[PDB]
Amino acid sequence: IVGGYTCGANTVPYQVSLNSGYHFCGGSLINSQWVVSAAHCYKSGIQVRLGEDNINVVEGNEQFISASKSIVHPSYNSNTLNNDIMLIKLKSAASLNSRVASISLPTSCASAGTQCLISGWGNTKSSGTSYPDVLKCLKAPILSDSSCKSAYPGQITSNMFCAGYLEGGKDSCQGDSGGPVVCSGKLQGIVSWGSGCAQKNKPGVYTKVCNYVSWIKQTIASN
Ligand SMILES: NC(=[NH2+])c1ccc2[nH]c(-c3cc(CC[NH3+])cc(-c4ccccc4)c3[O-])nc2c1
Ligand SMILES: [Ca+2]
Q1: Is the CB of 176 under 6 A from ligand 1?
Q2: Domain 1-12+103-210 identical in fold to domain 13-102+211-223
Q3: Tissue specificity, please?
Q4: CA dist 90 to 3, 38, 72, 171, Å?
Q5: Are 27 and 12 in contact (CB under 8 A)?
Q6: Where are the alpha helices (DSSP H) in the chain?
Q7: Are 194 and 204 within 8 A, CB to CB?
Q8: Is the domain 13-102+211-223 a CATH 3.30.559.10 member?
Q9: Would you give the distance in Å from CA 90 to the centre of its chain?
Q10: From the CB of 148, is ligand 1 less than 6 Å away?
Q11: Do residues 81 and 40 lie in contact, with contact meaning Cβ atoms separated by under 8 Å?
């Protein structure tokens, strides 16, 4: 997260860290046994780490659980990143409390101007790499589809939306991929891609979760 602030320990209880010997992507807990992340974060050997703040120090509240299976959307396109969503089923259910809790799926899509909270342990530098130990937060608005398509002509599908600042300086970045974009208590987006990080007129692009709620429910119900 570039231009954000320190969230504060366990203030984003649905945020998870996908780990393979190091933090490589974020995710969101949607129930005690399932996590939603981005398809491009897929790899084998994933350990889901819940209740984290400092990902380099066991401070208490952490729950490390292996993923039993990862389900990448069948229509995920790695070249356009269209349908960049994946579901991860945990080997055992997580113990939910105040520090570890799930976030609700939306019943309707959000409108432009909606203010959302984006969080993660990704790069905090737009020009260089600086990865944080604790969780960073950024409040950002959803931009209009016209501004988004104007910024990324021919690359935005109906399953994506832009959020952020056109002036640059505040944005999600590498390492934040797969993590949550929560607006009015509902998971509306998944950090997916962008051109650089926090560059002027190149806002972040997010997977539009409201377009996948029935797919998520049907997939969870049959697995
Ligand atoms: N500006 C943004 N809002 C933004 C958001 C998410 C991003 N994710 C990435 C990203 C970049 C790379 C390096 C490509 N030269 C790799 C990954 C990546 C992470 C895990 C697995 C595979 C790729 C990214 O998510 N850049 C990103 C930029
Ligand atoms: Ca920790």
Answers
A1: yes
A2: yes
A3: Synthesized in the acinar cells of the pancreas.
A4: 32, 16, 15, 30
A5: no
A6: 145-151, 213-221
A7: yes
A8: no
A9: 17
A10: no
A11: yes
Yes or no: say if 210 and 188 are a contact pair by the CB < 8 Å rule: yes
- Can you read off the two tokens belonging to residue 79? 């070249």
Experimental technique for the deposited model: X-ray
Rounded distance, CA 197 to CA 201, Å?
11
Q: What is the CATH number of domain 1-12+103-210?
A: 2.40.10.10
Counting ligands in written order, which one lies closest to the CA of residue 50?
2
- Please provide the DSSP assignment of 44-67 as one string: SS-EEEES-SSTTS--S--EEEEE
Resolution reading in Å: 1.4
Interatomic CA distance for residues 110 and 208, integer angstroms: 9
Instruction: Give me the residues near ligand 2 (ion), CB cutoff below 5 Å.
Output: 52, 54, 57, 59
> Which sequence spans correspond to the domains of the chain?
1-12+103-210, 13-102+211-223
Is residue 62 classed exposed, middle or buried when 0-12, 13-18 and 19+ CB atoms within 10 A define those classes?
middle
